[PDB]
Design a protein around this ligand. Structure first.
Ligand SMILES: *C(=O)N1C[C@H](NOS(=O)(=O)O)CC[C@H]1C(N)=O
Ligand SMILES: [K+]
Ligand SMILES: [K+]
Ligand SMILES: [K+]
Ligand SMILES: [K+]
Ligand SMILES: [K+]
Ligand SMILES: [K+]
Ligand SMILES: [K+]
Ligand code: NA
Ligand code: NA
Ligand code: NA
Length: 263
């Protein structure tokens, strides 16, 4: 069937010219709302949640892991690294790298998380360990953001990413202190106010991770604590036909607004 919410998302998509993917989980009743929920989309910087969570999982058996220093060298800088560039010829701890990757979307920091996991496949392996058979990370930063239509590399589906985000932030994929740390990091994101958050009532609390890439790819994954009800998990992924298309965070906000109006 096609629900009223799905019809509205289709109308939004038609006006956008691009391809929109949405997955909601309402933890009040475990129900789901999906739009292109099983189609693949390039994750771009939203993949940083999986990498940070995988390091948090490692830290469950190493009390000092998050304080371990990692050297930052001039050659490690990539296309966007506002935190790491302040530490060139020095070090950042794994906690500092996780916070920078999640809250400032520092791509050098993400590369250090990937390296701590043994490469992109270490991120995929963690996804599999927590029940996500769909996620794949194949490349490092910045090439994981090429976002080429039809390319399976560095993609997931909205359904899989919503389920994973639920298990990481509200479920038991991580230990309790690690889950709380991930939630704290997401709630302190600096980059999200134009995306899912912009479509929701002010009173609702959001923790999220955005992403963007070529093909006008514009993404956000969020945990939401609405006024007066149990938390929601919402993924909104968007990608466009031409390589140099402009970002469309407003489309993500519009998708979130439709979802909220449909509860
Ligand atoms: C993540 O998708 N990237 C790193 C950085 N993310 O900032 S955003 O989440 O606010 O878009 C810039 C865009 C992107 C990249 N292409 O490196
Ligand atoms: K800087
Ligand atoms: K920022
Ligand atoms: K792993
Ligand atoms: K699963
Ligand atoms: K902060
Ligand atoms: K908010
Ligand atoms: K094209
Ligand atoms: Na900054
Ligand atoms: Na900036
Ligand atoms: Na872009």
């Amino acid at each position: 069937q096609t629900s009223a919410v799905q019809q509205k998302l289709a109308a939004l998509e038609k006006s956008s010219g691009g391809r929109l993917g949405v997955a909601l989980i309402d933890t009040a009743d475990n129900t789901q709302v999906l739009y292109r929920g099983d189609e693949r989309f390039p994750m771009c910087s939203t993949s940083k949640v999986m990498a940070a969570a995988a390091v948090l999982k490692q830290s469950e058996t190493q009390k000092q892991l998050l304080n371990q220093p990692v050297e930052i060298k001039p050659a490690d800088l990539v296309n966007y690294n506002p935190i790491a560039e302040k530490h060139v010829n020095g070090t950042m701890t794994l906690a500092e790298l996780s916070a920078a990757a999640l809250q400032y979307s520092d791509n050098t920091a993400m590369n250090k998380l990937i390296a701590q996991l043994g490469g992109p496949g270490g991120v995929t392996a963690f996804a599999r360990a927590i029940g996500d058979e769909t996620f794949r990370l194949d490349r490092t930063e910045p090439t994981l953001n090429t976002a080429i239509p039809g390319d399976p590399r560095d993609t997931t589906t909205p359904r899989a990413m919503a389920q994973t985000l639920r298990q990481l932030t509200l479920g038991h994929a991580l230990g309790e202190t690690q889950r709380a740390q991930l939630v704290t990091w997401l709630k302190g994101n600096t980059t999200g106010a134009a995306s899912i958050r912009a479509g929701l009532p002010t009173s609702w609390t959001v923790g999220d991770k955005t992403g963007s890439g070529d093909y006008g790819t514009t993404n956000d994954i969020a945990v939401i604590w609405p006024q007066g009800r149990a938390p929601l998990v919402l993924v909104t992924y968007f990608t466009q036909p031409q390589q140099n298309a402009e970002s469309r965070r407003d489309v993500l906000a519009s998708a979130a607004r439709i979802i909220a109006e449909g509860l």
